[PDB]
Structure to design on (479 residues):
């Protein structure tokens, strides 16, 4: 049998009986499909142009102003498997979630990356790669340059995670690069919370995931 | 459709 | 019988005794028009801007203003016009290959220039600097000269420049013989630089155009051509 | 490849 990484159980808002879909297991893929960060582009060089346009390449594209877009390449990672969750039903979405016809839930809301070797650690990142293997953060989105000069940002309504142990059940925000922040002042605010240093985006057994209309339980 | 609509801002 | 726009003749540097790789190449009206014309402007690596460069079925021109910005001007089909290209490369986009006659370093661009000819009378032929590569892309790098126009559009010079001297400056009552002038990636006329590959552009030259006349000379920095023609500006009033 | 060379500056 393949390795089971964990299961996502949807917590329903209906007050209906818990169902039996509402559950989804994650399993080690036959070939790795995870990606990891790579080349940064500051201008529309032919290489950045490939990364966005080529559907065999992954890109995340940060919109800074009408003049400036940072395009960051995501190259293949043989150590990890990638699973995505969202409202869309398209090929990229391993687990389609639904409100419990306007939706606050993202089509491609987040990705879980699982190490393919023991102990198979799972990490959550905001946003999911669409069918063009592209992620886009628009001008209005909250973004920033980190202390080592890298791009990072938050989706519109964000991805929220509660851990069972630290390192007091308190929600934190997860950025597109897997960093952990305190909550915003309002759900869609264009201002990020304060960086939380000790905690990580590793999904512990019994972690809770919030996607703005769907709450999910992660078991290990 | 529902799955293709754009993601609404909560605020 | 196809319309003969005109003929290009190589002015050999060697001093020896005078086809696609031969010394003369005629330009003929094409069965289906292949000319391009300016179109959509992009100022940041938007997905459409990325489509303009990676799609090998779309012409585009990339103006490298800065380390943080390159501007992608698309060019779309023009059914009224035929386009021809000259240069050092032997790839399919070059219609007339051109070598250093001075006899692997060369000052001649692989895609030296394009000549665009009207498909209906007077069949006027215009000249532009630089041609499109096998990706249908033209690149103007950071160090080359560029500017924004009165129309607020991109324009620029190649490194060594495309140099044209017409027989006449125009066809008016103050008309004069023509002097060596510089043509841009967009076909506007400028006075010569102080050195050949100098960064500063010459001054704008109004009134004179890039309309080739019978007897126009095209210097591609290491190759010189003569344009001979029965049609166009030189013959129609 | 003389054809595939890069255009060197005259200056």
């Amino acid at each position: 049998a393949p390795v089971k990484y964990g299961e996502l159980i949807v917590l329903g808002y209906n007050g209906s009986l818990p169902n039996g879909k509402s559950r989804f297991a994650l399993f080690k893929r036959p070939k790795a499909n995870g990606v990891k960060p790579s080349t940064v582009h500051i201008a529309c060089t032919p290489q950045a142009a490939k990364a966005i346009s080529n559907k065999d390449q992954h890109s995340i594209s940060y919109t800074l102003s009408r003049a400036q877009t940072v395009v960051v390449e995501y190259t293949h990672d043989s150590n990890t498997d990638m699973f995505q969750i969202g409202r869309s039903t398209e090929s990229p979405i391993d687990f389609v979630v639904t409100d419990t016809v306007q939706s606050t839930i993202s089509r491609f809301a987040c990705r879980i990356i699982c190490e393919r070797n023991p102990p198979f650690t799972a990490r959550i990142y905001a946003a999911g790669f669409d069918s063009s293997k592209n992620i886009f953060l628009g001008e209005k989105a909250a973004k920033w340059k980190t202390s080592d000069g890298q791009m990072d940002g938050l989706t519109t309504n964000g991805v929220l995670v509660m851990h069972p142990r630290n390192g007091p059940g308190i929600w934190r925000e997860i950025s597109v690069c897997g960093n952990v922040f305190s909550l915003r002042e309002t759900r869609s605010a264009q201002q990020r919370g304060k960086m939380v240093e000790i905690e990580t985006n590793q999904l512990q057994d019994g972690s809770l995931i919030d996607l703005c209309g769907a709450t999910l339980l992660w078991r290990t | 459709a529902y799955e293709d609509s754009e993601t609404q801002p909560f605020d």
